Design a protein around this ligand. Structure first.
Ligand code: SF4
Lengths: 54, 182
């Protein structure tokens, strides 16, 4: 008996089940579909307060 | 050296005029340009706005002048903080190397006609710290000084006397009258 094998499960599993030059190129399968944000560096504002300052 | 005239010499002499140029102008253009200079100088003379740089020790006198004993706004002088709106800069205190580029930058960010008073010995010639590895010997080496107020510090009377001397210099400046020759 043939059962659905990893080849049959690789029929799908691309971003397009009939992958093309572009979809096959880049893939974005975050399984959870809930990708956490990645913290950035929020550079602050710089003030040369003084000397010329009351 | 000259000396004031004596009582009888004063009696002979007339009024010393008001415009320091005098009233000997020949032609209409000369006479007219004399008056316009007088008005300009009168404006720039009556209202003069120090920048209050005031680094140190001298600064305390720079504040006492603002104080109500020898009132300076009485003469038309006000401390505008922003150098774009300040017409005069009373450099007071020592000029260290860290400060030298700062003073230069502040000076030329100010628009002209800009006059500088070097108050105190520390600014005049480096004062008491003259032979120091970190001090600008004088402030003449960074900026064009206009009036020197000797003292350590100068007594407030001395400072605002110098201010009046600057007013006299502002009074006698010849810009239109002598553009006509230019
Ligand atoms: S000149 Fe005299 S009063 Fe002025 S900063 Fe130097 S030590 Fe102080």
């Amino acid at each position: 008996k043939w059962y659905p094998d990893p080849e049959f499960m690789k029929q799908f599993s691309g971003p397009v089940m009939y992958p093309d030059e572009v979809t096959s190129l880049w893939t974005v399968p975050p399984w959870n579909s809930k990708v956490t944000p990645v913290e950035k560096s929020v550079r602050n504002l710089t003030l040369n307060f003084g000397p010329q300052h009351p | 050296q000259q000396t004031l005239p004596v009582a009888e010499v004063a009696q002979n002499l007339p009024k010393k005029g008001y415009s320091p140029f005098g009233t000997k102008q020949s032609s209409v253009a000369e006479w007219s340009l004399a008056r316009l200079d007088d008005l300009l100088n009168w404006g720039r003379k009556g209202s003069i706005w120090p920048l209050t740089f005031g680094l140190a020790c001298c600064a305390v006198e720079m504040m006492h002048i603002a104080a109500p004993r020898y009132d300076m706004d009485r003469y038309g002088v006000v401390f505008r903080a922003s150098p774009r709106q300040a017409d005069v800069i009373i450099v007071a205190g020592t000029l260290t190397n860290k400060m030298a580029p700062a003073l230069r930058k502040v000076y030329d960010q100010m628009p002209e006609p800009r006059w500088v008073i070097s108050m105190g010995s520390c600014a005049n010639g480096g004062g008491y710290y003259h032979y120091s590895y970190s001090v600008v010997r004088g402030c003449d080496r960074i900026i064009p000084v206009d009036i020197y107020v000797p003292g350590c510090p100068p007594t407030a009377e001395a400072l605002m006397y110098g201010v009046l001397q600057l007013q006299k210099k502002v009074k006698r400046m010849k810009t239109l009258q002598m553009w006509y020759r230019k």
